[PDB]
Design a protein around this ligand. Structure first.
Ligand SMILES: [Br-]
Ligand SMILES: [Br-]
Ligand SMILES: [Br-]
Ligand SMILES: [Br-]
Ligand SMILES: [Br-]
Lengths: 215, 219
């Protein structure tokens, strides 16, 4: 299977730098151009640059938006792509994706990674407080309050439950995000079966589990 | 540095509708050596990474449904969906790769369906939150259509406007509904001064709101 996995994102202060990495597998890496693409929350994809394949000597090209300030490189023994991003400013806040580009024959980005979120801000890292929201169908929820930066990952039952889940987009205020998540299950199953909210906030090294008790 | 546009910016279509969206390049993307146009189409479903649909203007990527067809040449390109399905809600992007790469700005495809009223549920502040001095009252409005909806909070029968924040999920890929949360945040001391808390949803589905309420002193 082709796989691309970005890492190295997260919060960075204005004026700082980050090095993103993209670990690839399941294809002969050297045969491919590799691109980076970014997407500010809610806005359009922006191509940033590429590094060419071995046939073309691994040369680089960049969009005018970042040329001279970002540097793409690759490690062909470790099948990894990098983006060194310098001098960061507000417009650099985005999801950054690596994409597998051109092979010398097909002109397509056939595979993309999951993306890594970069937040350029001087606001301070804060872990969430997670609160349980207790009650044919029954709806339960958790409230994930007062954290920074994005993202959090919320699941239901360590991932036992999905079809009936709504995790709302967070909202930012006074430097902190809040969200919620609901889940709907048959009342024929609750409360016999424990329902559990799993909240991860890697920035703060928080991972919390909140059991929903009737109440 | 080739510049790409797309139109319309959005479209709203019912399941089974035929839809076309357009892309325009500033320069011809026809490569004269291969006689192909270096224009690709990507589908980005909500919360997911972009996915390749079409490359070389008209070649379908393996796995892609045959309802997706790319066409055009030179500086004008189109993506046509023969019969839209619920799962096709997405932003669709064209991308040139004739000289460097450039994405268009996207066409957002949303799905129209029959009107549906929300299912409402209300939750008092948790005892954990109250212990530390804050009080968030949560209302969920589930599985409704269309997206826009009126949510009103009352405290002891009086409307409350300040301190309410509302958030909507992306449209559902199976049933084409929306959901939304409404969160009222007060201090513990304010919360403890009132009894009845009510969330009222007024949807184009009915002149009568859908309401849920609790009384704090019955807690
Ligand atoms: Br390829
Ligand atoms: Br889930
Ligand atoms: Br090129
Ligand atoms: Br672009
Ligand atoms: Br009425």
């Amino acid at each position: 299977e082709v796989k691309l996995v970005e890492s190295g994102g997260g919060l960075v202060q204005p004026g700082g730098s980050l090095r993103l990495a993209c670990a690839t597998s399941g294809f002969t890496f050297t045969d491919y151009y590799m691109s980076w693409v970014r997407q500010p929350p809610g806005k359009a994809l922006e191509w940033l640059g590429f590094i060419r394949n071995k046939a073309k000597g691994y040369t680089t090209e960049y969009s005018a938006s970042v040329k001279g300030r970002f540097t793409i490189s690759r490690d062909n023994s470790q099948s990894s792509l990098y983006l060194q991003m310098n001098t960061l400013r507000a417009e650099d806040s985005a999801t950054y994706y690596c994409a597998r580009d051109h092979d010398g024959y097909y002109e397509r980005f056939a595979y993309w990674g999951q993306g890594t979120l970069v937040t350029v801000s001087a606001a301070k890292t804060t872990p969430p407080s997670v609160y349980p929201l207790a009650p044919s169908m029954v709806t339960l929820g958790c409230l994930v309050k007062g954290y920074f930066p994005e993202p959090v990952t919320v699941t239901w039952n360590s991932g036992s439950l999905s079809s009936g889940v709504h995790t709302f987009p967070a909202v930012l205020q006074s430097d902190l995000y809040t969200l919620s998540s609901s889940v709907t299950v048959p009342s024929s199953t609750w409360p016999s079966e424990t329902v559990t909210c799993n909240v991860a906030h890697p920035a703060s090294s928080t991972k919390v589990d909140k059991k929903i008790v009737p109440r | 540095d080739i510049v790409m546009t797309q139109s319309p910016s959005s479209l709203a279509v019912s399941a089974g509708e035929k839809v076309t969206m357009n892309c325009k390049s500033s320069q011809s993307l026809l490569n004269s050596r291969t006689r192909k146009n270096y224009l690709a189409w990507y589908q980005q479903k909500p919360g997911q990474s972009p996915k390749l649909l079409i490359y070389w203007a008209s070649t379908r990527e393996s796995g892609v449904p045959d309802r997706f067809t790319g066409s055009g040449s030179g500086t004008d390109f189109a993506l046509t969906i023969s019969s839209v399905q619920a799962e096709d809600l997405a932003v669709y992007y064209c991308k040139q790769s004739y000289n460097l790469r450039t994405f268009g700005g996207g066409t957002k495809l949303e799905i129209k369906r029959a009107d549906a009223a929300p299912t409402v549920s209300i939750f008092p502040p948790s005892s954990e939150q109250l212990t530390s001095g804050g009080a968030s009252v949560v209302c969920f409005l589930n599985n409704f259509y269309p997206k826009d909806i009126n949510v009103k909070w009352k405290i002891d029968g009086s409307e409350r406007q300040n301190g309410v924040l509302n958030s909507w999920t992306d449209q559902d890929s199976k049933d084409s509904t929306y959901s939304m949360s409404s969160t009222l945040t007060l201090t513990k001391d304010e919360y403890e001064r009132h009894n009845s808390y009510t969330c009222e949803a007024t949807h184009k589905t009915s002149t009568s709101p859908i309401v849920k309420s609790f009384n704090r002193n019955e807690c």
